[PDB]
Design a protein around this ligand. Sequence first.
Ligand SMILES: *C/C=C(C)/C=C/C=C1/N(C)c2ccccc2C1(C)C
Length: 137
Amino acid sequence: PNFSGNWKIIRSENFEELLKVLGVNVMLRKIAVAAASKPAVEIKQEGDTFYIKTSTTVRTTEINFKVGEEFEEQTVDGRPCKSLVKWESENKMVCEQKLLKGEGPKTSWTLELTNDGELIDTMTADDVVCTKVYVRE
Ligand SMILES: *C/C=C(C)/C=C/C=C1/N(C)c2ccccc2C1(C)C
């Protein structure tokens, strides 16, 4: 199925805690979890090729990738990483990340589409999991 769309957040669980495991200091966390930082996600999918733009009121970030091909992005806390996405199933992709420099928590993300059209974004840092759920506007 098709991940394309303009997605708006309807659920967010455990995001502040993910930030703590990543070592984001408290001043930045308050900003990051504020409504001004609420994410909107735009996806354009063509087969295995994806464009994903994630924007807030003050920030915008775009990734471009094809499933199975390595690309560069940033960890949630903004460290450059090499990422690789694979299909876990027909409706679910999983991305492993490796830091370009230094050491840190093991991080990953997954995106999956439910039959009822919800987009579930899961982010992990070691033993902590954050889940965000979106629907199409
Ligand atoms: C991933 C979530 C981020 C970056 C921010 C979300 C913040 C909020 N806030 C402050 C809020 C208040 C009411 C309902 C929903 C939210 C949301 C989780 C968007």
